[PDB]
Amino acid sequence: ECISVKGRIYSILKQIGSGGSSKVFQVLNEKKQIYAIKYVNLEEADNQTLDSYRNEIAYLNKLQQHSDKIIRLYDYEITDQYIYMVMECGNIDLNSWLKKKKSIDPWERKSYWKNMLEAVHTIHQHGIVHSDLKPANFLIVDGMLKLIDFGIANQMQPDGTVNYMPPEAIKDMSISPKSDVWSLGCILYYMTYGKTPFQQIINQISKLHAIIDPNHEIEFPDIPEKDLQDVLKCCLKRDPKQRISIPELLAHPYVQIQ
Ligand SMILES: O=C(NC1CC1)c1ccc(-c2cnc3c(NCc4cccs4)nccn23)cc1
Ligand SMILES: [Cl-]
């Protein structure tokens, strides 16, 4: 089982994901290095879908030079029939790593948050609001967390959830960078307390209710890191105008004082 891309040949080791007409494979080049190749079948694809994938590739190419907390794109090939993207392969996604972990190391949680902030900061500077951040969107490679996509095209499922949905995303059924702060908050909450803020409410219709509800209060058990407590509280403010910004989160003692 092989894949060729712009001259070069690759052996499929394992399929790691699949979505709308796309598949992500862990593969090897001739020198026995590991990559992740994404394949998209374009045969039965809208002009909307095509344009979203074109928009994804352009943004991923551009955003290469600006942060190394964005997945590396080594090469790509696009025709009317398919797209191949040769990207970095990670060790493990952040969702799978959080589910395997007993207790999160305080220094390693702070390192990861820094990484997430840098990645999301970067896409914001180029006018992208992701809008659907989850642990599944971050990948552990080398020592660092990297963002793997931009919420531009359809997300890959591993081979959903509303636990990270911001209140204004539910309230706007009748886009701000503050929306990414909420979701990033929820990942940090999970990294801190072992649960997302509303992971206790199993009913999805009931889950959407607590997120929008001012009179529902999120609990914050006290911890050694009083800075971390505060970061969590400012990210998880229901009113987006009063919610903390990425550039503020970067000036925050939790991230600055070592
Ligand atoms: O589609 C992606 N990004 C859009 C901008 C183009 C995308 C999807 C998956 C990956 C990727 C690259 N590496 C991984 C990975 N690695 C852990 C593994 C799981 C199984 C074998 S390795 N798990 C999940 C996803 N991985 C990178 C980019
Ligand atoms: Cl912001």
Swiss-Prot record:
Query: Impact of mutating residue 161 to A?
Result: Loss of kinase activity
Annotated ATP binding sites:
16-24, 38
Q: In which tissues is it expressed?
A: Present in rapidly proliferating cell lines.
Positions annotated as active site in the UniProt record:
132 (proton acceptor)
Q: Where is the Protein kinase domain?
A: 10-255
On the tree of life, the source organism's domain of life is Eukaryota
Q: How does it assemble?
A: Interacts with TPR; the interactions occurs in a microtubule-independent manner. Interacts with MAD1L1 and MAD2L1.
Q: Which family does it belong to?
A: Belongs to the protein kinase superfamily. Ser/Thr protein kinase family.
What role is this protein assigned?
A: Involved in mitotic spindle assembly checkpoint signaling, a process that delays anaphase until chromosomes are bioriented on the spindle, and in the repair of incorrect mitotic kinetochore-spindle microtubule attachments. Phosphorylates MAD1L1 to promote the mitotic spindle assembly checkpoint. Phosphorylates CDCA8/Borealin leading to enhanced AURKB activity at the kinetochore. Phosphorylates SKA3 at 'Ser-34' leading to dissociation of the SKA complex from microtubules and destabilization of microtubule-kinetochore attachments. Phosphorylates KNL1, KNTC1 and autophosphorylates.
Which protein are we looking at?
Dual specificity protein kinase TTK
Question: Which residues of the complete protein appear here?
Answer: 516 to 794 of 857
